[PDB]
Point group: C2
Chain length 184, copies 2
């Protein structure tokens, strides 16, 4: 049936057991199946953790980083990550429900032109593989983003590809603790 | 006018100056323009270097990792990265000419069924955002790769998207020092 084993602490390769233990604690007692999946390839698990940590340090706000991640997961057609990021945006960030709804639905953010442009720029980045074009780039800057922010969106898109494509490949089952955030 | 400044050591953000110094030395006295572009966003430059170092110790061989990078740069239409990885493959792997020519055009690899499937798998990942299908996934295992290798290909694709998409957006000028390798 499954292409991949979703690893537990018990079955994961020794050198990632300590990381899965950390993940489980940090998540209040469960391992999101994305991590259990990436445990199959410790360099892929390592990349996902490490880039996550670099990305937090980037030129975007934590809300803007979630704008990038949710929009990418929706554009990439990845249910697991739409659910995972929704849960993070609610519990970690307490994102306004209207912002969250818009991002999940890939529809306009009416309250905040800045974030709405960022969302739309992320879609264009993904579909064009970065060749967004003169007009899309100029609209990105007009609302106050910079060339640095542009490359930090690419960074988020790059991170989104690792987890969205991996979950797309595995058809990763959605943990019971994420099931309520599933799109829909 | 260009959308991005290509940074020098002098113009870069303070916290990446040392990275640029190290890059310049490693390349014998020049900075590849991707690096001067990424310098605009220190975290994107740092991700590119960090993930490169992780990818180069993954479950694929050095040849297989370049199969993935070049195939991805061709598929993503990124001219800079094709030249950058052709350079690395010639210098640092001594890749056979038939292999290198086939990667650079995404034409089949006739001498090597295993690398031909890897190359095809990579294209499928990129064109299907990972939904490569049961049959493409089975051909991948039957050739000798593992589920682990498959996620390490996704890893390579993700790293390629960072540099390919950035270079695509900037239309990064190709350094004179890389020109011999273009096309
Ligand atoms: Cl467990
Ligand atoms: Cl310089």
């Amino acid at each position: 049936m499954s292409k991949f084993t979703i690893h537990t602490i018990e079955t994961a390769p020794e050198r990632v057991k300590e990381t899965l233990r950390t993940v489980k604690k940090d998540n209040g007692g469960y391992i999101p199946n994305l991590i259990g999946l990436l445990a199959n390839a410790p360099t892929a698990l390592e990349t996902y953790r490490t880039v996550g940590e670099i990305n937090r340090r980037n030129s975007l706000t934590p809300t803007e980083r979630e704008v990038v991640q949710i929009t990418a997961a929706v554009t990439n057609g990845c249910a697991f990550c739409v659910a995972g990021h929704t849960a993070f945006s609610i519990k970690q960030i307490q994102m306004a429900p209207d912002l969250l709804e818009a991002l999940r639905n890939a529809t306009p953010i009416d309250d905040d032109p800045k974030l709405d442009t960022l969302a739309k720029f992320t879609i264009a980045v993904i579909n064009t593989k970065g060749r967004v074009g003169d007009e899309a780039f100029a609209d990105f800057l007009e609302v106050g983003y910079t060339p640095e922010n542009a490359l930090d969106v690419v960074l988020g898109v790059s991170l989104a590809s690792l987890c969205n494509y991996a979950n797309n490949m595995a058809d990763t089952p959605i943990n019971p603790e994420l099931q309520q955030y599933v799109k829909g």
